[PDB]
Design a protein around this ligand. Structure first.
Ligand SMILES: CO[C@@H](C(=O)N1Cc2[nH]nc(NC(=O)c3ccc(N4CCN(C)CC4)cc3)c2C1)c1ccccc1
Lengths: 256, 92
């Protein structure tokens, strides 16, 4: 249905690894969308064209207020195009750089939004979503939007810092990886940096595999409780997403 | 609407009953080209065959002499499907 001729290409919102993302207007209604461009020659040289083809199909089925809508995709001789929902407030990473760290009301609200989105994904048997701050966009109301396609986003890597112990050892994993990621993100929101950050890969690996981290003195007991419940080495000991949404620190501080 | 693959489709040689067509291939790999042809009058049926993506020419044979024909070619991307077509007319 959707084709390139249906859109007027506006200003660039930013550059990805494989091409630019443009503000776009559907010609007939002037509805504001985002047009993502990925060069085929670059996709093939990186060996991610197959991965992109598979993941556009996956993302097209995910309908949730905190997941960025992928409305369709098309191509020409040199480019693949994605028609995406427009998130006007940018990445939560840039907000975190601006504020240094988020207060508990802002953090707990973000965590609620992501726990809702991750529960929806799990209901579709889709797991391990990319919820690093650099890959999360913000809607017009300041609500988070999961983007995934993290390999297509221009930046050291943040992936390692968010991987649970079962993934860094390349073992079989389940939906509990998203609970660990939630705990890593809740810490980074409140502290301003991820909990297992280290200056080498082996050091970061050691910190994750041992779940070695500390809290700054200002992190409150409720926040420590939630984060510590999520950062369990044994995935089956991590809570259900419903327990996160009902955690006392979440319900006392979330506006959602 | 703005682009098509292939581009610059043309008849380079002909007999009373056959056409040799040629086109410009893009940089990206193409699985194959879909070639359709039929009497331009719109009443006769359209015939279709495929040609491997490594080719840039094809022969259309079994044509009637002194008849207007419409020839259409579009490529197929392995991952992203068909491209927009390009059409030409030729009188045998
Ligand atoms: C590279 O792909 C894009 C992508 O797919 N996308 C799809 C999609 N939809 N909406 C988007 N918005 C922006 O790129 C953007 C950037 C800055 C912006 N401002 C900067 C500061 N604000 C205070 C004012 C407004 C506002 C919007 C994107 C990017 C991507 C980028 C980052 C994370 C994930 C994906």
């Amino acid at each position: 249905q959707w084709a390139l001729e249906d859109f007027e290409i506006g200003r660039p919102l930013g550059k990805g690894k494989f091409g630019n993302v443009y503000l776009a207007r559907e010609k007939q209604s002037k509805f504001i969308l985002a047009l993502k461009v990925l060069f085929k020659a670059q996709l093939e040289k990186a060996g991610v064209e197959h991965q992109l083809r598979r993941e556009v199909e996956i993302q097209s089925h995910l309908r949730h207020p905190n997941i960025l809508r992928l409305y369709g995709y098309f191509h020409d001789a040199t480019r693949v195009y994605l028609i995406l929902e427009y998130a006007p407030l940018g990445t939560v990473y840039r907000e975190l750089q601006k504020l240094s760290k988020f207060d508990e009301q802002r953090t707990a609200t973000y965590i609620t939004e992501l726990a809702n989105a991750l529960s929806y994904c799990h209901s579709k048997r889709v797991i391990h979503r990319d919820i690093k701050p650099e890959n999360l966009l913000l809607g017009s109301a300041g609500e988070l939007k999961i983007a995934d396609f993290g390999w297509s986003v221009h930046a050291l890597c943040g992936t390692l810092d968010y991987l649970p112990p079962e993934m860094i050892e390349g073992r079989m994993h389940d939906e509990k990886v998203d609970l660990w990621s939630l705990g890593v993100l809740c810490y980074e929101f409140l502290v301003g940096k991820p909990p297992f950050e280290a200056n080498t890969y082996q050091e970061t690996y050691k910190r994750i595999s041992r779940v070695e981290f500390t809290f700054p003195d200002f992190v409150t007991e409720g926040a420590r409780d939630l984060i510590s419940r999520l950062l369990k080495h044994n995935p089956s000991q991590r809570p259900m997403l419903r327990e996160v949404l009902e955690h006392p620190w979440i319900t006392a501080n979330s506006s959602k | 609407s703005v682009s098509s693959v292939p581009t610059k489709l043309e008849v380079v040689a002909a007999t009373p009953t056959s056409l040799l067509i040629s086109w410009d291939a893009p940089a990206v790999t193409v699985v194959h080209y879909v070639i359709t042809y039929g009497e331009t009058g719109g009443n006769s049926p359209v015939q279709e065959f495929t040609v491997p993506g490594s080719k840039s020419t094809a022969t259309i044979s079994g044509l009637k002499p002194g008849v207007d024909y419409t020839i259409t070619v579009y490529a197929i991307d392995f991952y992203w499907g068909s491209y927009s077509p390009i059409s030409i007319n030729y009188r045998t």
